[PDB]
Write an enzyme that holds these catalytic residues in place. Sequence first.
Site, short mmCIF file in Angstrom:
data_model
loop_
_atom_site.label_atom_id
_atom_site.label_comp_id
_atom_site.label_asym_id
_atom_site.label_seq_id
_atom_site.Cartn_x
_atom_site.Cartn_y
_atom_site.Cartn_z
N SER A 61 -14.80 -4.04 -61.91
CA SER A 61 -14.26 -2.77 -61.36
C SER A 61 -14.58 -2.65 -59.86
CB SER A 61 -14.71 -1.56 -62.13
OG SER A 61 -14.06 -1.49 -63.39
N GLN A 117 -5.84 0.45 -69.67
CA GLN A 117 -5.67 -0.98 -69.55
C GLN A 117 -4.19 -1.33 -69.60
OE1 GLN A 117 -7.33 0.65 -72.31
NE2 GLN A 117 -8.88 -0.81 -73.11
N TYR A 147 -9.41 7.77 -65.47
CA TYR A 147 -9.74 6.46 -64.94
C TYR A 147 -8.90 5.38 -65.60
CZ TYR A 147 -12.65 2.37 -63.87
OH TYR A 147 -13.12 1.15 -63.42
N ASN A 149 -7.19 1.16 -65.13
CA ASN A 149 -6.93 -0.02 -64.30
C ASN A 149 -5.49 -0.02 -63.80
OD1 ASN A 149 -9.56 -0.87 -64.57
ND2 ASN A 149 -9.12 -2.54 -65.99
N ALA A 311 -17.69 -3.43 -64.52
CA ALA A 311 -18.05 -4.01 -65.80
C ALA A 311 -17.03 -5.07 -66.16
CB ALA A 311 -18.10 -2.94 -66.90
N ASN A 336 -23.18 -7.48 -69.44
CA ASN A 336 -22.75 -6.08 -69.30
C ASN A 336 -23.67 -5.17 -70.10
OD1 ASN A 336 -21.50 -3.52 -69.10
ND2 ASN A 336 -19.63 -4.11 -70.21
C1 LIG Z 1 -17.03 3.25 -66.56
C2 LIG Z 1 -16.55 1.97 -65.87
O1 LIG Z 1 -16.59 1.83 -64.56
N1 LIG Z 1 -16.10 0.62 -64.18
C3 LIG Z 1 -15.75 -0.01 -65.32
O2 LIG Z 1 -15.19 -1.29 -65.35
C4 LIG Z 1 -16.02 0.81 -66.43
S1 LIG Z 1 -15.66 0.37 -68.19
O3 LIG Z 1 -16.73 0.66 -69.15
O4 LIG Z 1 -14.60 1.23 -68.74
N2 LIG Z 1 -15.11 -1.25 -68.36
C5 LIG Z 1 -13.97 -1.53 -69.24
C6 LIG Z 1 -13.81 -0.85 -70.45
C7 LIG Z 1 -12.74 -1.10 -71.29
C8 LIG Z 1 -11.80 -2.06 -70.93
C9 LIG Z 1 -11.96 -2.74 -69.73
C10 LIG Z 1 -10.92 -3.79 -69.33
N3 LIG Z 1 -9.50 -3.49 -69.17
N4 LIG Z 1 -8.80 -4.67 -68.80
S2 LIG Z 1 -9.81 -5.89 -68.70
C11 LIG Z 1 -11.19 -5.17 -69.08
CL1 LIG Z 1 -12.78 -5.98 -69.17
C12 LIG Z 1 -13.03 -2.49 -68.88
#
Ligand code: A1AUZ
Length: 354
Positions: A61, A117, A147, A149, A311, A336
């Site tokens: 991230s 996602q 939030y 991606n 993460a 992680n």
């Molecule tokens: C709170 C936070 O702040 N920055 C972060 O990355 C997070 S997180 O917990 O939500 N990470 C996360 C959670 C669920 C899916 C994915 C993902 N989607 N496409 S690939 C990937 Cl791996 C990434």
Amino acid sequence: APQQINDIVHRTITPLIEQQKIPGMAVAVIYQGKPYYFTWGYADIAKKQPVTQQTLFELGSVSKTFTGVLGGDAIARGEIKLSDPTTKYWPELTAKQWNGITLLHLATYTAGGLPLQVPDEVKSSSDLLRFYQNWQPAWAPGTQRLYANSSIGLFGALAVKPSGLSFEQAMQTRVFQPLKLNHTWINVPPAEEKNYAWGYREGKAVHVSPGALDAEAYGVKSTIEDMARWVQSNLKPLDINEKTLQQGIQLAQSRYWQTGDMYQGLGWEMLDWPVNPDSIINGSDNAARPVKAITPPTPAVRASWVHKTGATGGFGSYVAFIPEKELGIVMLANKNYPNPARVDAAWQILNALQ
Ligand SMILES: Cc1o[nH]c(=O)c1S(=O)(=O)Nc1cccc(-c2nnsc2Cl)c1
């Protein structure tokens, strides 16, 4: 290394590994402008390769703060405008739900609840067009913050289209190179493969997987020295010689939305310093939040806690800093583990060096 920094770093950091079973960590701390590097553990437990200051971790991230700054850059250059509608940079998007949706919505996760996602079945440009063409917002634009991606991933894909260059190529010629981040890469080359550390999830060795819009949101791997130089750039943007990049950083730390006691910027999160620790610790745990618009976006406030999490399946990363005291700290690790542990650790170390 001053004894105070060294001591507090170790007495805080070593239990974290002991409790979280983290294979390898690189930790850099910036104090009065001077960086300091610390490592622990193994980068490749199978090849008994340790973690060094040239060991690469997947930022995940924390790539979004890069994607923010690269956009603010193009704001400075006048190529893209944060107020235009999405359809001005993507005419083929003929859906009536996108009307009203600017690039600020795309950037600050206020587009109406775009998915967190991008679906794994989306591989080609045609699949990406249909995905965003058939999506239907949960809420009105500019009202609630989810939030995601795919919201920020499209912002960074569209923020480079007038300039005619690929996102990797813009990134490299307009942020990575000028700041002398020479060990940060989007695609790791064979030459640096040896510096590439394997992530460990469930005991199994894993790396980031190709995906649609993956460079734009979580595709940036970097080394602990490049994170230190990056924090040093974000502490005081006035020393960057390039005027578009300085403005791009300064915009990235601008408060566009407010939710609870947090502010939304361009990839970063700001908090009025000093902050209640427990409040932000529970604020860093892993949902639909509504936002009270800040008209107009506040300029970068020096006395702020500016932080962001990253993460990935196999890595965890955290970066935080306070401009006013010229302090900062970044943690990166090939497992992680929970974010509130990172945040607690940052808070004690930074409070001690404060
Ligand atoms: C709170 C936070 O702040 N920055 C972060 O990355 C997070 S997180 O917990 O939500 N990470 C996360 C959670 C669920 C899916 C994915 C993902 N989607 N496409 S690939 C990937 Cl791996 C990434």
